[PDB]
Amino acid sequence: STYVPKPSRDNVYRFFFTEGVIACKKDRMGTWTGTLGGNTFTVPCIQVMQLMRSLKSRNLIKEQYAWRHYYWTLNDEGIAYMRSYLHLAPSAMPNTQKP
Amino acid sequence: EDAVRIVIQKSLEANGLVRGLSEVARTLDCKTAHMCILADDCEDEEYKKLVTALAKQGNIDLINVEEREKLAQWAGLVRRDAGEVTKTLKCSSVAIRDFG
Amino acid sequence: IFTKPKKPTHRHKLEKMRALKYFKVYKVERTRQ
Amino acid sequence: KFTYRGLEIDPLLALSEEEFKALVHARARRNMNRHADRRPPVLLKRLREAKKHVKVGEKPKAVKTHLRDVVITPEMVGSVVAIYNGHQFNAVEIKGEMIGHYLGEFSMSYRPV
Amino acid sequence: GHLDQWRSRQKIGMGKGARCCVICSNQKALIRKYELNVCRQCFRENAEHIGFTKLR
Amino acid sequence: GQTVRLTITSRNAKAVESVTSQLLTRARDEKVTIHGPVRLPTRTLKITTRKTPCGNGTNTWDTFELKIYKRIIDLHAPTEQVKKITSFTMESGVDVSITILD
RNA sequence: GGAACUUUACCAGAUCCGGACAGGAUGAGGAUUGACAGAUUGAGUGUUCUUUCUCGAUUCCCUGAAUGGUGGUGCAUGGCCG
Ligand SMILES: [Mg+2]
Numbered sequence: 181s182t183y184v185p186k187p188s189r190d191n192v193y194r195f196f197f198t199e200g201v202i203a204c205k206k207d208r209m210g211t212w213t214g215t216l217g218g219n220t221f222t223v224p225c226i227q228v229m230q231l232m233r234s235l236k237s238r239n240l241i242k243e244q245y246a247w248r249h250y251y252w253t254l255n256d257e258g259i260a261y262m263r264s265y266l267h268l269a270p271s272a273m274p275n276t277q278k279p
Numbered sequence: 280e281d282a283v284r285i286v287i288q289k290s291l292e293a294n295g296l297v298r299g300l301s302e303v304a305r306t307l308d309c310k311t312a313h314m315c316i317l318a319d320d321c322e323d324e325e326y327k328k329l330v331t332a333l334a335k336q337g338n339i340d341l342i343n344v345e346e347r348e349k350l351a352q353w354a355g356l357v358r359r360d361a362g363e364v365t366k367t368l369k370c371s372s373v374a375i376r377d378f379g
Numbered sequence: 380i381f382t383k384p385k386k387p388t389h390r391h392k393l394e395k396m397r398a399l400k401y402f403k404v405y406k407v408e409r410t411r412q
Numbered sequence: 413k414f415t416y417r418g419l420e421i422d423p424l425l426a427l428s429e430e431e432f433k434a435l436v437h438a439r440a441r442r443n444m445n446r447h448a449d450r451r452p453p454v455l456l457k458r459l460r461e462a463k464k465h466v467k468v469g470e471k472p473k474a475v476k477t478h479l480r481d482v483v484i485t486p487e488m489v490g491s492v493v494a495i496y497n498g499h500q501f502n503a504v505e506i507k508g509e510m511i512g513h514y515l516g517e518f519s520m521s522y523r524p525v
Numbered sequence: 526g527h528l529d530q531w532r533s534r535q536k537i538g539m540g541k542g543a544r545c546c547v548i549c550s551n552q553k554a555l556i557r558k559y560e561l562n563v564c565r566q567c568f569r570e571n572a573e574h575i576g577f578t579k580l581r
Numbered sequence: 582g583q584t585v586r587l588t589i590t591s592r593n594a595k596a597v598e599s600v601t602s603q604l605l606t607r608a609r610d611e612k613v614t615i616h617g618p619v620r621l622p623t624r625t626l627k628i629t630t631r632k633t634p635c636g637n638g639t640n641t642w643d644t645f646e647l648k649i650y651k652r653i654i655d656l657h658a659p660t661e662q663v664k665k666i667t668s669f670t671m672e673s674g675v676d677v678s679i680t681i682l683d
Numbered sequence: 684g685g686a687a688c689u690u691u692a693c694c695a696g697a698u699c700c701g702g703a704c705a706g707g708a709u710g711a712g713g714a715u716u717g718a719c720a721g722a723u724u725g726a727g728u729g730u731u732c733u734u735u736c737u738c739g740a741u742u743c744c745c746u747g748a749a750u751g752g753u754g755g756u757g758c759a760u761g762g763c764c765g
C-alpha cells in the first residue's frame with residue numbers, strides 16, 4: 181500500500197533533513213528503520229519509495245542506485261523545501277552540512 | 280479574531296490542529312483536546328449546538344468567530360492557482376490539541 | 380469479449396453532517412457505545 | 413451395497429472425526445492432521461447449505477470451487493461439486509465410492525490424445 | 526481484503542521465487558555456495574572484486 | 582601460566598606472512614615463550630560457472646579459486662602484554678583474533 | 684532449464700496502481716482510505732453491492748505526461764561468450 185500516513189511522512193522528512201541522505205533497499209516487501217532523537221521508527225519500504233519518487237520528480241533530491249539499494253540526497257532546493265515543510269529555524273542544517 | 284489567527288497557525292505545526300465537524304467532535308467526546316473554535320455562520324443550528332455541547336460536557340473552551348470564510352482561510356483550507364480568493368473550503372469548526 | 384457485466388466504479392455513500400447522528404441532544408449522550 | 417472399509421453409509425455418517433481419520437489412508441490422514449488447526453474451507457458449509465435446501469427426490473444445486481486437495485468425507489456424499497479444471501467448472505456428483513479421495517481426482521484438466 | 530491477498534504467496538518466502546541476486550535482483554542461476562546469492566553472470570562480472578581468481 | 586592464542590587469517594599470503602613475522606619479532610622482543618607459528622591447512626574456495634551468458638556454444642567453464650591462509654601463535658603472556666604486542670599498524674585484509682585457552 | 688505454488692515468460696479468470704509530476708473540477712458542511720453482517724464470487728476475497736461504520740487531505744476524475752514490462756527487433760547496439 182502506497183497510502184502514506186502523514187506522521188510517517190513527517191518522520192521520514194525529519195530524518196531526511198537531519199541525516200542529509202537516506203539509503204533504502206529496493207524491495208516491495210520490507211520495512212525501513214530510521215533513528216530520530218534516539219529510539220527508532222519503521223515505515224514500509226514501499227512508502228519510502230513513493231515519497232522519494234515524488235521528491236525526485238519535483239527536482240528536490242538526487243538519486244543513486246547500486247546493488248538493490250537506493251541512495252537519496254537532499255540538494256539545496258530540497259533542503260529549502262524541507263526547512264519550509266517542517267518549519268525549522270533558518271539556522272537548521274543537515275549533519276553533512278554542519279562542520 | 281486576531282490572536283486566534285496566530286494560535287491556529289502555531290498549532291498547525293506538530294499536527295496539533297484538527298479540522299472538520301467529525302474530527303472535532305471525535306476529539307471533544309474522547310477528550311485529548313484543549314479548545315475548539317466555532318464560526319457562528321455554520322448554516323446548521325444542530326452543528327453549532329452539538330459543537331458547543333460536546334465542549335460543555337467535557338468543560339472545553341469555545342471561541343466564536345464572526346466569519347466562516349476567514350477562519351477557513353486561516354487554517355489553510357484554500358485552493359491556490361497565489362489565488363487564495365479562488366476557492367476557500369468551508370471550515371466552520373477548528374479544534375486544537377497541541378498549542379505548539 | 381466479456382461475458383460478465385463490468386463491476387462499477389466504487390462510490391462511498393456520503394451523508395452530510397453525520398457527526399450529529401451519533402449524539403442525541405443539554406445532557407448529550409452517544410447513541411451506541 | 414456400497415461399503416467403505418467394511419462400513420455402510422449410515423455408520424460412516426455416525427463416525428466422528430478422529431475415527432474417520434483413523435479409518436482413512438495415509439495421505440488423507442496426513443492432510444487431516446496438518447489441516448487440524450487451520451480453518452476449514454467455506455466450500456464445506458456451502459455444500460451443507462445446498463444439501464439442506466433441496467427437497468427429497470431431486471439433486472442439490474452444484475457448488476463451484478477451485479479447491480482440489482479436499483478429502484471427501486461421508487457427509488459430503490450426495491452433494492454436487494463443480495470443480496475448476498483450469499478454464500471451466502465440471503459438475504460431479506459425490507458418491508460413496510469417492511470417500512477418502514481428493515476433489516481434484518474427478519475433474520480432468522487435460523484431454524486424452 | 527485485497528491488502529491481505531496482495532503478495533500473500535510471496536509472504537511465505539519459499540522456493541526459487543523468494544531469493545534473488547544481491548546485485549541484480551534476478552531469480553535465475555543463483556549461486557548459493559558460501560551464501561554468495563549472486564547470479565552466475567553477475568558473479569563472472571564481479572568475481573575478481575569479491576576475491577576469486579581464475580587459476581587452473 | 583596462562584596461554585593466549587592469536588589466530589591470523591587472510592586471503593593474501595604475503596600479508597598474512599608479514600603480520601605473522603611482525604608478531605613473532607615483537608614477541609621475541611618481549612622475552613616471552615612462544616608456541617608456533619603453526620601454518621594451518623590452506624583452504625581453497627571453488628566456484629565453477631559456465632563462461633557464457635545465455636546458453637550458446639561449447640559448454641566451457643570458469644574455475645574461480647579463493648585461498649584462505651591461517652596461522653596461530655601461542656603466547657605465555659598476560660592479556661595486557663598480548664594487547665601490547667598486537668598494537669601496530671596491521672596490513673589490510675589480515676584478521677587477527679585473540680583467544681584465551683583453558 | 685532436476686518448473687507442485689513461486690520461478691513463468693503460456694492458458695482461464697479475479698485484483699492492485701507500482702499513472703511520479705504539472706494544469707483544471709470536487710473537497711474539513713469532508714478529497715478520500717479501510718472494513719462488521721447479508722450476497723456477488725473460486726474466494727467467512729468491501730472485487731462490487733445493500734446497510735452501517737472508520738480514516739483523514741496522504742488520495743481520488745481528467746488532460747497532457749510518466750512508469751514498469753522474461754513486449755519486439757541480437758539484421759540498430761554495448762558487454763560477454765562460442
Ligand atoms: Mg501464477
Ligand SMILES: [Mg+2]
Nearest residue numbers: 637757758760
Ligand atoms: Mg549477431
Ligand SMILES: [Mg+2]
Nearest residue numbers: 757760761763
Ligand atoms: Mg552480439
